[PDB]
Amino acid sequence: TLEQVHLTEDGGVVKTILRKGEGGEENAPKKGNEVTVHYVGKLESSGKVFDSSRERNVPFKFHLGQGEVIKGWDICVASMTKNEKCSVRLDSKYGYGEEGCGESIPGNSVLIFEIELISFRE
Amino acid sequence: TLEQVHLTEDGGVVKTILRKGEGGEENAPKKGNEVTVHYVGKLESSGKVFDSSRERNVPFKFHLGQGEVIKGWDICVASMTKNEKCSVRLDSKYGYGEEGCGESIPGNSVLIFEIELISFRE
Ligand SMILES: O=C(NNC(=O)[C@]12C[C@H]3C[C@H](C[C@H](C3)C1)C2)c1ccncc1
Numbered sequence: 308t309l310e311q312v313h314l315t316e317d318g319g320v321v322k323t324i325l326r327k328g329e330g331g332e333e334n335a336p337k338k339g340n341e342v343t344v345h346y347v348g349k350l351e352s353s354g355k356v357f358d359s360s361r362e363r364n365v366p367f368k369f370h371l372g373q374g375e376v377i378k379g380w381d382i383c384v385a386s387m388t389k390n391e392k393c394s395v396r397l398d399s400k401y402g403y404g405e406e407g408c409g410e411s412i413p414g415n416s417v418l419i420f421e422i423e424l425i426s427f428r429e
Numbered sequence: 430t431l432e433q434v435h436l437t438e439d440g441g442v443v444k445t446i447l448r449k450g451e452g453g454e455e456n457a458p459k460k461g462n463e464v465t466v467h468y469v470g471k472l473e474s475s476g477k478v479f480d481s482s483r484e485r486n487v488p489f490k491f492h493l494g495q496g497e498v499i500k501g502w503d504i505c506v507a508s509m510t511k512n513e514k515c516s517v518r519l520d521s522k523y524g525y526g527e528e529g530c531g532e533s534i535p536g537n538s539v540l541i542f543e544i545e546l547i548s549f550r551e
């Protein structure tokens with residue numbers, strides 16, 4: 308019943324909106340903007356959480372579209388609007404690829420992130 | 430001739446100040462503060478740069494002391510003051526450990542980061 312939006316043509320970044328954000332230009336973030344989000348990241352296969360800003364109780368901030376984050380994140384957040392909450396499924400291409408990252412992210416891992424866009428600014 | 434400051438007792442985080450920052454309480458950042466830095470990260474062995482905010486020409490921001498970054502970074506930046514520029518050598522314990530992170534960071538890699546603390550805020 309919830310729509311799944313394919314943000315790439317290879318099925319590699321698939322976003323499901325769990326809560327719609329606010330409409331209007333003033334509510335969609337722009338390339339380079341500092342975006343403030345909460346996220347929980349888990350492996351698709353095991354469901355094991357590898358990283359969470361919610362566990363930190365500190366909103367995470369990055370500069371949109373500049374490669375400060377994995378590519379699936381730049382693509383997913385570019386599609387979001389203020390207050391939007393989503394679950395995105397990232398193929399390893401859009402994640403940490405063949406080699407993974409640390410113990411908690413094996414090579415060739417599909418990652419599932421719940422991401423809430425809290426605010427942004429220039 | 431330049432001092433090397435061992436910020437842990439295991440030799441794992443060794444900081445060399447290349448340019449002294451400004452003194453005074455108002456110029457040392459506090460746990461939880463948003464710190465704005467430029468960095469260039471390279472592998473010690475090969476010297477190959479794996480990541481650089483300077484190449485992005487976008488200052489990188491994180492929340493100090495909250496595990497938003499590798500542990501060597503939390504330790505190193507906690508010791509810095511506004512405008513300080515340093516080179517820190519991180520044993521893999523304080524980096525990406527046994528498994529590394531992606532192609533560009535093999536397991537058991539010593540990382541060398543040049544880090545400039547530009548500003549911070551609460
Ligand atoms: O992990 C790297 N950048 N980080 C990222 O893309 C993220 C991945 C997780 C979800 C958000 C916040 C944290 C944890 C950092 C984005 C990285 C990749 C390769 N080499 C060094 C760092």
Ligand SMILES: O=C(NNC(=O)[C@]12C[C@H]3C[C@H](C[C@H](C3)C1)C2)c1ccncc1
Pocket residue numbers: 358408409412468470480489497498499502530
């Ligand atoms: O790499 C992760 N967090 N990122 C980090 O600690 C850094 C490492 C590099 C220097 C700064 C800016 C970028 C690149 C992210 C800090 C990470 C580790 C494990 N799992 C997911 C993300």
